[PDB]
Design a protein around this ligand. Structure first.
Ligand code: ADP
Ligand code: ADP
Ligand code: ADP
Ligand code: MG
Ligand code: MG
Ligand code: MG
Lengths: 541, 538, 548
């Protein structure tokens, strides 16, 4: 009675495999273990949320109070957590908004369902309960809409759109960053009396150029872009020509050499004497044609030779490398020209227009600025960020990426209508689902009630970060909905929040309809998978 | 639940705890399956010391081979505890718990609860106790049938040893047991019957001695070897020196006073020897024909041995506690401790006392008693394992035959008890019983588990076990309608049925009763257990 | 696929425990394990047998041609081989004769059983076959017996007894070794003819003291005994006749001190003056009663004091040390004295009779001799065994123990009952047992047949060790027992046997004129214990070991 018989299925699967089935207690092991990371996204929720510093294995430090950026770097061994990880990444790549709601809801559905499993309700019935509750949630959100927008062009109308998104990440900066993003969208959208038929928009239109140093208030908007690059050859005129035609060549400016390797063959010395002048006259025949039409700027992606640069210096033509291929096409969108791997000659139809190009230092480093006034632009803009630390500017970039991603979420579908925010529609869904559970008798009614209780974390998480008592403002808020005016009740965050009532229209906090629908679906599908599994099979390392 | 609490632990639950109890049961069953029956295989046990000990008893196999499994240690205590008081039925308990677990485990896989299954074993066990009253047969001890005791002795001895050892050792037990029965009818096994080791000519030369044999003899040469009429004397007083409770120096002053005080060592011994001489003066008549012998429980000083040698008194020292409790039964005398009050009534009687020696050791033989109330069984053997094999055979044979005289009943064996319970449990009306629900298979599981024992006897002979029960089943189908009460058996010589009533195969009453009771308790407790774990400080 | 499950449910027992069933040819391996050391016994049976070196872990070496002795030191792993060790140990303790035979037979019965088990005979029938052969074997040994001793003491009869026994162990020369035993046997025996008394003989009476140096021809037969002692006071040749007296005391020759805190106590100077002289006068006064009885040598049992020694050598009393129990008891049997632990007067009836006590140089060390004369004979005589190598002294000494053990065989049974040796007793049983197989029906006939084939090892071994080809010597001997109707009625074909040295063909010129025979009591228990050795090994079908 000292050594056990060692589980005589040990002839089966190797020691590295671990089984954690149910009955043994898998659900109890999982729902709990994940409460640690549930508090991470809960503390980082709201305008007063705390950002989290994540140092990866390489050492690149990041500080972001979201959920998709954090969990991407966290090497998590627990498999049940990873269902929540890439489910949040789906929200990042598709909509770019609602990472944290997804985490505080997908995890809360597992936390609140502790009562159902512990009481002894069937796991199969719980999946059917949340699925039917999911369908009722999607149908009911359409009726609580009061922000039906149809203009979606002017800048003041975006104050109900961008400023709630920017107010979440770093609440202290609202008017400054909203002016940068809203002015960027106005430059992106074309000037027209009526632009319809689903005009195209992409996240790559608005780029972010991070410059070290300078206060956030000193930032400005640039219609072109700004590269950390050294110009060569001459100083610009900056007002003399009034406009500049810019040719963008994929291939470098050099004598056309083949892909297969060759060399110089000379049978006699007569060709040796003319070979020094032949290379000069060869490029001169191709370079003189470019200068006739007045191309005052050339952009060659590959390395430019010194012989080609020498002929361009005397005529005063600007040169630029732009080695990366992705950022090469964005410059073409500004001027409105096409790429040309052939040398050929410049044509008027394929060549664009650029007002001026000027060179200075913004944060000590010399950069090239492609700002133009009175010119025609189409889907291009940049926001020059000035900040004290690179760690803080990284969060401003992702905040802007989430802001412009919401613009993609609006203009791509037919309607991206608003909803009441600040803990207004979430408590309404608790009343709707509470009334829905009594309409259908059956054993699944317990699942319908507990599905509503999971939505409670949204108001109190704003109160917990605000340093307020949850047991005072949360039940007091229910008395305000008794009865339009009752729909616009929300959670106040201020020193005068003892009353617990603040009107939404005074500050215009709103949320998107499509963002919450996609978040509720991915959250329910995430909880559906975790509650459906019973056995989890590991492996060695 | 146990891993976050204890940083290191092992836990099996709800499928492995059931597989462990069945797999360990089938594993331990396969060890003792081949030993069961008369044609079973022998089994030696040699440790790192190199000694050898040979026997077929399951208790010796279990209580000598260390075992790590938690199930088998309960089978070891169950097989040992049943044999330690009864002396028979060791492997039968292992086969029942070895078979009843696997026979119930098939229905646990079907999804029947362990609680209601064990409820069927308990109510089925009560039916077997009611069946023992009708199945047994009354036997009157006043007849004093010696042939009936010979057949009971051959039941256990044929299982352990062959026919050559059984025929010569059977009447050794019968002559010892024939003296057990008396008017008081009080059974006494440990004090009356004993076993003693002696390396001699062969195991076949075992003989019966009616008196008490002793493993010591006369130290001095001049002391008599053989005595015709020796009247014994029991004295638990120690006749050597005694150190005397803190008493210290014989402070001697002069040299003559030194030896004068050294002579006082003899005065305490001579004070007790004079009482023996005064006792010898009363029985001094016919001194050359008669004799006298003294047996002491503690040591005797060598200075005093010369006193007994001069008077031709045989001296024996350092006897056991058990031998002092047996001289009164053999010689018929009475015991004495102090030398103050003596009488001729306490002296025993012996018709022949002689000594025989081999090598350095010497044995004293006493026999030819007038009315001996006890006796001994001096077993001969060649090797140490030969004595150990005869130890377990005589130990299990005396306990099996002694239980027949305790009660007035005896159970016939050879599968008659198990085959009879099979038809009884499978044909009895269930409405008479109080069990309902899913107790249908519990009756069939325990009833079918009893069939595996009598065919395990056949598995050692090599015949087909399922075919030799065909005519057995056909015999009982016609025996009930033929109006003839007979009990069938299993003869392994020819592979056909037999009758244990005429063949002499029998079994004791409390063996099968305590076996099923101990086996049903252990097998039920192992089924209800659904979790195994190890935890503690070390 | 990469690794087996390595025998599941193996945690029932410990990892060191292993099972060994009859299957997988393991019973054949146990027969092969016997065959390893059995072939060592082939070179060691017979007069041409070769001794064996056995170096123990301590370094004590014993050279020997016997089995029971060699198997004591070898540590054995196989349990079935240990059955042969204890079977031969039983042979040495009881009879002290015929142990190579036990091994040789119990090993060949397992050899021929290798063929029987391979054929398909059940193990239960094999035991029944040899038991039925054993009852017929022991029956016929009593039938074909010829000759008897009929006299306890004779010069020529003992040459027929001792000589064939010691011929196996250290043959050498026949006469010089046999005369040392036959002379010593006559000294210790209580002859007492025409009295009707029961004979008596002890193995511990004849004992050999090993002394280095000399040669085997210079060995003599001493009437008394000998130790390697030194007299303390003085040495004496004792040329005075009119025999001395002997007094044996088991206690030390000193003042009997008090067992409990013997300490002096002197209150005044008057006791201080007399305490020194009191011990002298007290020890002297005890010697007066001892000295007046005419004793001149006292054997002490423990350490003797110096003051007691001063008064002993005053009157010329010899002192002898015997600091052990058995060394003191063996000496009383020579002179026939009754010791008493008291320091008083020895009784005249209890005083022993020894004529002379000499001290001479034999092995370079001091030794004391107690030779008696023809008058007033004694028992427990010794044999001075001289040799060059200490290892040869050990094996020759145990040959005397085997010869003395053979003399024990005459006392218990009714007589001698000698048998023909040199393979004649084995080869005769082959024809009788073979005829017995033809008379009995059943499947046991092959067991009876192979039992006869196992008895061929004695003539096959003696022919192999003798440097002869067994293929020609063995069937030439069968012609003496295959024969019929030949002239003489009083048939003398039973004494034909093998021969180690000499004539071609080999049937020996009788074992007769040669005066070599075997004892019936040795053959009875040898075949009994050899069959038990094969019975216990063949009857077991499963073996379990531990730690190896
Ligand atoms: N000044 C404010 N007053 C009231 N509520 C606010 C204020 N600023 C932000 N909020 C609330 O904080 C919440 C933060 O939500 P967040 O997790 O950023 O949205 P998402 O999950 O879609 O990215 C918003 O729902 C918003 O209603
Ligand atoms: N010669 C025989 N013929 C028929 N049955 C026998 C014979 N010998 C033993 N048995 C049976 O073997 C069973 C076990 O016997 P025993 O060895 O006394 O108990 P255990 O095997 O439990 O130690 C008994 O039930 C008995 O009926
Ligand atoms: N000189 C000889 N000639 C023929 N046979 C002999 C001779 N010496 C010995 N033998 C035979 O060899 C056998 C050897 O017996 P063995 O077992 O060695 O005796 P021990 O028990 O003394 O060792 C004897 O039985 C005897 O018959
Ligand atoms: Mg947001
Ligand atoms: Mg038994
Ligand atoms: Mg011999």
């Amino acid at each position: 009675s000292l050594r056990l018989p060692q589980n005589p299925n040990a002839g089966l699967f190797k020691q590295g495999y671990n089984s954690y089935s149910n009955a043994d207690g898998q659900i109890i092991k999982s729902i709990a273990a994940i409460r640690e990371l549930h508090q991470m996204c809960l503390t980082s929720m709201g305008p007063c949320g705390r950002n989290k510093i994540i140092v990866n294995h390489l050492g690149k430090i990041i500080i972001t109070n979201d959920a998709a950026t954090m969990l991407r770097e966290l090497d998590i061994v627990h498999p049940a957590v990873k269902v929540l990880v890439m489910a949040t990444e789906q929200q990042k790549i598709d909509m770019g908004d609602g990472t944290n709601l997804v985490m505080i809801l997908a995890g809360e559905l597992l936390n609140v369902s502790e009562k159902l499993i512990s009481m002894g309700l069937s796991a199969v019935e719980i999946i059917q309960g949340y699925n039917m509750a999911r369908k009722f949630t999607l149908k009911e959100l359409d009726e609580m809409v009061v922000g039906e927008i149809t203009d979606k062009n002017d800048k003041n109308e975006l104050l109900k759109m961008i400023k709630p998104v920017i107010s979440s990440k770093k609440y202290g900066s609202e008017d400054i960053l909203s002016e940068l993003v809203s002015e960027a969208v106005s430059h992106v959208l074309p000037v027209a009396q009526q632009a319809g038929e689903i005009p195209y928009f992409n996240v790559d239109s608005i780029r972010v150029v991070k410059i070290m140093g300078g206060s956030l208030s000193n930032s400005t908007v640039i219609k072109g872009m700004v590269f950390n690059r050294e110009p060569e050859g001459h100083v610009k005129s900056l007002s003399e020509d009034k406009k500049h035609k810019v040719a963008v060549f994929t291939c470098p400016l050099d004598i056309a050499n083949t892909e297969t390797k060759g060399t110089v063959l000379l049978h006699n010395a007569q060709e040796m004497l003319d070979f020094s002048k032949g290379e000069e006259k060869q490029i001169d025949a191709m370079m003189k044609e470019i200068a006739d039409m007045g191309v005052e700027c050339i952009v060659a992606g590959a390395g430019v030779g010194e012989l080609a640069l020498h002929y361009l210096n005397r005529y005063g033509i600007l040169v630029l490398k732009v080695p990366s291929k992705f950022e090469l096409r964005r410059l073409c969108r500004v001027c409105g020209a096409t790429p040309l791997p052939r040398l050929g000659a410049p044509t008027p139809e394929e060549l664009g227009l650029v007002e001026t190009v000027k060179t200075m230092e913004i944060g000590g480093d010399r950069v090239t600025v492609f700002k133009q006034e009175q010119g025609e632009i189409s889907r291009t803009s940049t926001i020059i960020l000035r900040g004290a630390t690179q760690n803080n500017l990284d969060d401003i970039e992702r905040a802007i990426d989430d802001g412009v991603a919401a613009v993609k979420g609006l203009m791509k579908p037919s309607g991206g209508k608003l909803l009441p925010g600040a803990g207004a529609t979430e408590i309404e869904l608790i009343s709707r689902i509470t009334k829905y559970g009594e309409r259908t008798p059956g054993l699944l009614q317990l699942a319908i009630k507990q599905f509503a209780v999971a939505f409670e974390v949204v108001p109190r998480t704003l109160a917990e970060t605000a340093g307020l008592d949850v047991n005072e403002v949360l039940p007091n808020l229910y008395a305000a909905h008794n009865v339009t005016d009752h729909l616009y009740k929300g959670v106040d965050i201020d020193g005068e929040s003892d009353e617990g009532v603040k009107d939404i229209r005074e500050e215009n906090i709103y949320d998107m309809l499509a963002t919450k629908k996609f978040a509720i679906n991915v959250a329910t599908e995430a909880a559906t998978t975790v509650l459906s599994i019973d056995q989890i099979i590991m492996a060695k390392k | 639940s146990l891993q976050l609490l204890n940083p290191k632990a092992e836990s099996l639950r709800r499928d492995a705890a059931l597989k462990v109890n069945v797999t360990s049961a089938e594993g331990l069953q396969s060890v003792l399956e081949t030993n069961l029956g008369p044609k079973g295989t022998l089994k030696m046990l040699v440790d790192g010391a190199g000694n050898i000990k040979l026997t077929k008893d399951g208790k010796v196999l279990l209580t000598e081979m260390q075992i790590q499994s938690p199930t088998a240690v309960l089978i070891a205590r169950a097989a040992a505890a049943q044999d330690e008081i009864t002396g028979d039925g060791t492997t039968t308990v292992v086969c029942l718990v070895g078979e009843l677990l696997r026979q119930a485990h098939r229905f646990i896989q079907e999804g029947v609860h362990p609680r209601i299954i064990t409820d069927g074993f308990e109510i089925a066990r009560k039916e077997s106790m009611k069946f023992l009253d009708e199945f047994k047969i009354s036997k009157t001890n006043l007849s004093n049938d010696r042939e009936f005791l010979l057949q009971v002795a051959r039941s256990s001895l044929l299982t352990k040893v062959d026919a050559d050892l059984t025929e010569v050792l059977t009447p050794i037990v019968t002559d010892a047991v024939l003296s057990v029965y008396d008017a008081q009818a009080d059974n006494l096994d440990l004090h009356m019957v004993e076993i003693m080791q002696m390396q001699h000519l062969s195991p076949k030369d075992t003989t019966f001695i009616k008196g008490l044999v002793l493993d010591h003899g006369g130290r001095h040469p001049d002391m008599p070897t053989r005595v015709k009429n020796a009247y014994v004397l029991i004295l638990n007083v120690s006749l050597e020196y005694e150190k005397t409770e803190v008493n210290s120096g014989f402070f001697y002053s002069s040299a003559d006073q030194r030896d004068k005080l050294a002579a006082s060592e003899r005065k305490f011994v001579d004070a007790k020897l004079k009482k023996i001489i005064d006792l010898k003066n009363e029985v001094c008549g016919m001194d050359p024909d008669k004799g006298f012998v003294i047996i002491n429980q503690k040591g005797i000083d060598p200075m005093s041995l010369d006193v007994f040698a001069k008077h031709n008194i045989l001296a024996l020292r350092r006897a056991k506690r058990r031998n002092m409790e047996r001289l009164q039964l053999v010689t018929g005398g009475e015991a004495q401790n102090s030398v103050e009050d003596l009488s001729p009534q306490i002296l025993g009687f012996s018709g022949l006392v002689y000594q025989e020696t081999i090598g350095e050791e010497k044995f004293t033989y006493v026999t030819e008693n007038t009315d001996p109330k006890s006796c001994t069984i001096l077993i001969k053997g060649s090797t140490h394992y030969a004595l150990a094999q005869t130890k377990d055979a005589v130990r299990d044979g005396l306990r099996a035959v002694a239980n027949v005289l305790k009660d007035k009943n005896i159970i016939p064996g050879a599968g008659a008890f198990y085959i009879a319970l099979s038809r009884y449990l499978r044909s009895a009306n269930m409405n008479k019983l109080g069990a309902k629900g899913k107790t249908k298979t519990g009756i069939e599981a325990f009833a079918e588990a009893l069939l595996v024992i009598p065919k395990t006897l056949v598995k050692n002979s090599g015949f087909d076990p399922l075919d030799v029960l065909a005519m057995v089943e056909d015999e009982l189908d016609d025996a009930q309608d033929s109006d003839e009460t007979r009990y069938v058996g299993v003869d392994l010589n020819i592979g056909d049925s037999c009758d244990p009533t005429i063949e002499g195969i029998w079994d004791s009453y409390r063996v099968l009763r305590n076996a099923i009771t101990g086996a049903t308790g252990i097998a039920s407790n192992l089924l209800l257990c659904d979790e195994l774990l190890r935890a503690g400080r070390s």
